Amino acid sequence: VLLDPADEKLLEEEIQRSQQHAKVVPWMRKTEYISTEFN
Amino acid sequence: LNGLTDRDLCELNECPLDPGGYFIINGSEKVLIAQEKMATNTVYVFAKKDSKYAYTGEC
């Protein structure tokens, strides 16, 4: 049986947006949690 | 507690974040507040108004 990925994508009707949480910004950073071992 | 690891401090029921630097006297954490003073061995010249002295070289 034949199953091309180009045919696999045409089986769906519409599945395929923004990523603006990830944007690099020098006045903003990330976060830090509680490990068990540290300094 | 000197150099003692976080594991061991927790085993001692101590806090690895606790800074130290205080005494325990009869169970009370007592800090010695750093007391400011005039520097020793150093000459200082002051004018003390309301006195017979125009200038005073303290040491």
Side-chain angles (χ1 to χ4, degrees), chain A residues 5-6 22 26, chain B:
Chain B
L1 286 45
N2 190 27
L4 193 59
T5 77
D6 309 322
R7 297 291 68 63
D8 300 318
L9 291 174
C10 298
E11 290 174 22
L12 300 189
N13 294 313
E14 271 286 314
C15 176
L17 313 193
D18 189 84
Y22 57 84
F23 300 85
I24 307 159
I25 320 293
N26 303 324
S28 291
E29 309 105 0
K30 308 280 176 163
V31 293
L32 295 189
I33 317 294
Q35 296 291 124
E36 171 194 303
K37 55 164 51 165
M38 286 302 299
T40 53
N41 302 350
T42 306
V43 183
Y44 299 119
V45 187
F46 305 114
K48 45 161 60 178
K49 76 177 188 80
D50 311 319
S51 86
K52 64 178 65 180
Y53 309 107
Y55 311 105
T56 289
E58 179 177 335
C59 179

